[model samples]
Target: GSIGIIDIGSNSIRLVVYDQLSRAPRILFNEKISAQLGRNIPVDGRIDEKAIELAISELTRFWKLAQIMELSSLRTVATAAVRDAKNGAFLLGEIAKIGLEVEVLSGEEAGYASGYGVLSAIPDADGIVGDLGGGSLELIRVSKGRVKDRVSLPLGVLRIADIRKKSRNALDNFISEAFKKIDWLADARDLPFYMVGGAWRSLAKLDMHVRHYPIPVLHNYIMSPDRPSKLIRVIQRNNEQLSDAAALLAVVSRHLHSRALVTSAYGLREGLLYLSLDKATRKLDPLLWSANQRGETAGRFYQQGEALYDWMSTLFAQDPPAYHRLRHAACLLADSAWQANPDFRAEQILSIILHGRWVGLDAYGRALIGQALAVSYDGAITNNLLSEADTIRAVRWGKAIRLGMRLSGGVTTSLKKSTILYRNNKIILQFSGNYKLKGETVLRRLRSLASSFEASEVVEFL
Candidate 1:
């Protein structure tokens, strides 16, 4: 069943509908409006009347859209802004008038959810996750797929922008001091810091624009700490001049920019969904789970690919853990675009693998999957599109996939009946039952595969 989540944050309100509830769910529709509800709280600690009105208006529209989408399960979550406001309950009451139940997340709950969001996308992710919202920043230390310590501080962008208006250096110092108070953060210096929230994403977007990055996707983008520090210094130096302009527009005219310098695409919204899943589902390998889901959607080819993977594994042995996991994903995605034209199938597959929204894999894993798919169709890797090092690895994997496809004739029955092995310094392909693997294409691919491994090729029928 399709499910939708309405996230009411300090800076923005967003509605994201997932196609289904699974280990790896795909987005059906996503929309966000900058509400900035935390901009100005009154002296009596009440939320400003204007912010409440704006939130209600946005919530009305989101509710109507959710109804149109016919979501089976809908959840509305209010974060830092609502939690901090003294009249937050009043705002939630107004939201309830729209026939939607909104859950107010405490600072600790928000931090933990954001941490789960990071883990959902990057299973083995280990480090500190910082969710910088407009009202408050949630910091959590995550190591070996578990949360160890968490703290929510009242140091969000809007709050900082309003409080420390005169001096950018003061704001920086404040942030430094706040971070120093977290005793466990010192130990996380060597670990990767995953950032979440729109303000930080805007900073990441600006950094991407400054540096010409190839990929435009924001999730799982890894960058050195120096890059963000340099961008911060630039922001600090021009703070006075850039104050009038929106931070996003100061760097680039549009919202969409180049590759980001952070490794986050999934955040609080995703975290909400991740926490709702059962523990067993959460334990599944994210990459394989996602690939299997995608392959299942692609049709009968997925079954054939699974068969091919099992058969090929008998011949190819002793692969590294990363390589083995990646290879399994590659097999699942092998025939993803079988409906495309024969001439363009390889290119299409490569494009999908490289640019698809699939998560849990790094650049090298993505490259390997693309190359394996390309080689499955006997596609050449002569193009200079990807980096030289990755291209070489792609070619190697491509050759192996092409050989496997040829041996099985790209069918489940043939793959099951066929036996492949390396014995007596030769790669052997033996066919059983009524299988008769005799074709020029088969012979050519067999020789190519043998050459890839520096061994002779032989085919026997019984």
Candidate 2:
């Protein structure tokens, strides 16, 4: 399936084409237009007519490009601005006149789609997917590969920053208050928060700039709380002269190039692609939902479990079925017990893992599951309690589960026709198919991941 995606965002409009095979899709071409769709929207929330016309013109061009590329499928969607604006319907109706169907995605749909996009990049993500746009913010909680909770807030960076320009602490208050509305947000307090959207990407760029990161594309970056916090602080303190990032770059002199803990450039368009690609397979069964389905259904609960197994397989060189089912079970039911009391959800997950159908794994594996469950929030976990071997296995398993859940998109539709074998204490992870993954970045990341395992661990990709 050769598909083209058009993302109409507040900051810019982008077009991306992918050659989709039985395996993962490969990006063939990408183009962008700086529409600045939200350039001068007043507090009254009326979109500028010129901005709308510019966006329409760009879409018209993208439509021709999609045809030129002979794309099998083409989709266009607008987020944040279109979804939030009172005149969204009117604008969408006009865009449809030019044969471009502009679907205004609900916040939840946007969040899940963006979550899938993130999973495509970081297959082993076990955290709430946060997508901040120019007009609104979307969140989808993904456990294993399922979406547990999803919500949209009117706290987009541009909108919030615009409204709260007078207050020094407005952004913080807005984020905090917005999160408060979603009761389930606390459930992901300790989990890794995978960020998406322009602000985050901008933050990543700043981080990359400070650290001399060579990768211009935001997808290759990874962030933790450290750089994000520092970046946020910088933005907060230097609100007046915020355009110059170099001032903040000086504060991060030593920590440059560590991990691009900034943000992501992917959003609803990527999400829509993920959804449309796997929607059929996910519709077949609940447990077999793709990664997007998982994010759509169970939230961020299963992300850790799946990621754990994925990393484990890479580190220990396990086979496909070696941990697929276990990882699936982890993601599928990561939050099955959430209906219970909130305080006991962690213990419930722990108990379920210990006594449930998939409970026969080693203590280290079980501890890994338990630790992942415990660390659902950002609190601390004592990895030191486990022996060095156990800790290594735990981390490895977590990584494995995360990546596997991501690769398959948490959908049980299954990628078939391959076998894996391990010997000489080396886990030979092989993907035998008619074709190969051409992206150097993905291959490099996979190899780097293999190296993160113990010295005894070796992943031979053939």
Candidate 3:
């Protein structure tokens, strides 16, 4: 079920193989080759000869790798570099020699693809998605999961880098001139700006390293709105390698006055994978899908997770859908890390959940889930990543998960045979089909759960 995608861009070519063709696929293999195909495009409107040779050799190598991995499907796509070059067809013919064909994406298609990448990572992304590549920058507006108005500008880092070399004023005027033509960008002011591309990611990593941030995952890393002057300060201390990226971001931030700047680890490659999914799969909760897959492969019983969620629903009946989703994910991952050593079970599981390669969950959600699993394993929450109220709520969730697991005993039949209800600040447990499922340990867990809820517990046989 492996799926492979090769992105041939102006600067680099990358090959990624996912373990499956599911909505939230995990990367099984990844490799990149620097193919500066667009290095000479702006100078002569053609890909450099050496770059074309390197691309063909590397693409053929990637094709061989896909064969070795037995990838079920492989998609090869080329962007601005190949699309804008006069000799692009020559490069395609070279690639076709290895019995491999590539789809050269038009500017608008590339813009939409960039937006799709952001949506694939941040499902409800509503704002402007700016994907800065070596040859061009694709700007698209996204509301929820849909792509709206878009434009592709030639203010790419490589081009701008060369522009600034000759005259700094021209670089500034060039970008400003191009941005002014995109009339829809004015409507996107004050929205969250989701940045894509390697140059931006390097900027994000630089910010992360400088701030000494606690959690290091980058997919949903958010930097709240800061004045452009402040950004200028950081870039001042930095080298010129990122100057173009910083300068572009500074201008973009000023133009849009966005509320926040968020980083995404997922982009065009993930988007291509997303584009091929069925309607039902596309609509599945990516966070739940990834956790469900983990539970299926790592837990003692997969069905028990579903039963656990339903059985635990009684205690959290009044909670909103957001809390329900957190609880559902908790139940699914309850027994995922049980095989680890008792001494470090909480530590190991907490790290993985917090920094998991999961989509659709924000930083706060990560904290909630991490704390829930930590407490459910009889472990303490040690991270200062949440507010006082959130920390308490997460601990309560963890306790309920603990009690549910104790009562259900990793079996759905046990859950079906017993009924748990919450009413009038009391947790009531009733057993049917004989009450062998209830015992001392179950009572102990009930005591802990009820204590967290500040409620009474009543046990009865049906």
The clash numbers for all candidates, in the given order, read: 0, 67, 0
**Tens digit of lDDT per residue, candidate 1, span 1-462?**
999999888778898899988887889998888777776653456777887888899899989988998999999988645666787877888899997998888778888899998888888877777777777767777778777888887766666555457665555555566666677765665566777777766666665666766655567766655455466556676533223213312221111121233467778888878888898888888888878877778845554667767877765566555677788888777767778888898888888777787778877677677776887765444544556655554564566667667666567556777777777678787777536566787778777767766689998886
Per-residue lDDT of candidate 3, residues 1-462 (tens digit): 888998988887899899998989989988998888887887798788899889889999999999889888888899745765899887888887876778888887787788888888888889998898887788889996888989888777777666777775666677677777878887788998888989889888778777887767788878766633455578787656577787777777667768888887778788777888887778888888888888888887764678878877777777666777877887788888778887777787787797678888888788888888888887433458777766777777788778878787776656777777877888788887647777899998888888777789999887
Model 2's number of clashes is 67
Give candidate 2 regions above 4 Å deviation.
21-23, 39-42, 80-87, 212-220, 232-266, 278-462
Residue pairs in steric clash, candidate 3? Answer: none
- What digit string (tens of lDDT, one per residue) describes model 2 on residues 1-462? 688878887767888887753123446788888776665554657677877888888888888988888888888878655656676677787788878877666666677788876554444456666676655556676676566778776655455545346565554454555555567755565565556765566666776676765323344355555555466565666532232222222222221222223243445655565566554543232222332233334454443344433333433444244345444445544434545676776676566555532212334444555554443311112464466654554444444433343344343223232222335544344555412432343343334334435323333344
* C-alpha-based local distance difference test score of model 3: 0.80
**Candidate 1 overall Cα lDDT vs. reference?**
0.72
- How much RMSD separates candidate 1 from the native structure? 5.0
lDDT of each: 0.72, 0.53, 0.80
Best-matching candidate per TM-score: 3
In model 3, where is the ten-residue run with the lowest total lDDT? 224-233
Residue pairs with clashing backbones, model 1: none
